[PDB]
Amino acid sequence: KVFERCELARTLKRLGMDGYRGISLANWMCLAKWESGYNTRATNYNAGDRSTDYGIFQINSRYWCNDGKTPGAVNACHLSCSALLQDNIADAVACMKRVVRDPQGIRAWVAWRNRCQNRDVRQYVQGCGV
């Protein structure tokens, strides 16, 4: 599923992401936009460590989900990576919350750092009624 910007903004807010661990809704929108373009079926194979990034937030299978084919990986969100390609994103969001309960926070994603951090992201939630 490819979300419309405001559709995603309301969806994320309803899931309790607005201000989750100090992260505004706008930062999450900016991350999803740069990570997948709001596409839930988006995946990215990393040939180096043989891991794959799944879904709207591109969660990596080496540490967050099990896909059975990534060498020596763990499954910290306790989900099949399959759960990360669903049109319904509650699982993906529950996983993203586990991810930012760690030290790095949202900084774990270089994309957030390059196109979101120290930049104005309000533009992502303008007119969405969130």
Which CATH number goes with the domain that contains 93? 1.10.530.10
Q: How far is CA 70 from CA 44, 58, 79, 95, in A?
A: 13, 15, 14, 18
Rg (CA), the chain: 14
Helix crossing, 5-14 with 25-35: angle to 10°?
Answer: 130
Q: What is d(CA 31, CA 34) in angstroms, rounded to the nearest whole number?
A: 5
What method did the depositors use to determine the structure? X-ray
φ/ψ of 76, rounded to 5, equals -60, -25
Mapping DSSP to helix (H, G, I), strand (E, B) and coil, where does residue 66 land? strand
User: Which domain range does residue 35 map to?
Assistant: 1-130
CA neighbor of 101 nearest in space, from 71, 49, 62, 64? 64
Among residues 4, 7, 18, 35, the one annotated as catalytic is 35
Experimental structure resolution, Å: 2.2
Dmax over Cα atoms in the chain, in whole Å?
Answer: 44
CB 85 within 8 A of CB 57: no
Among residues 4, 49, 53, 102, the one annotated as catalytic is 53
Asked about 35 being catalytic, the answer comes back as yes
Q: What is d(CA 114, CA 73) in angstroms, rounded to the nearest whole number?
A: 27
How many domains in the chain? 1
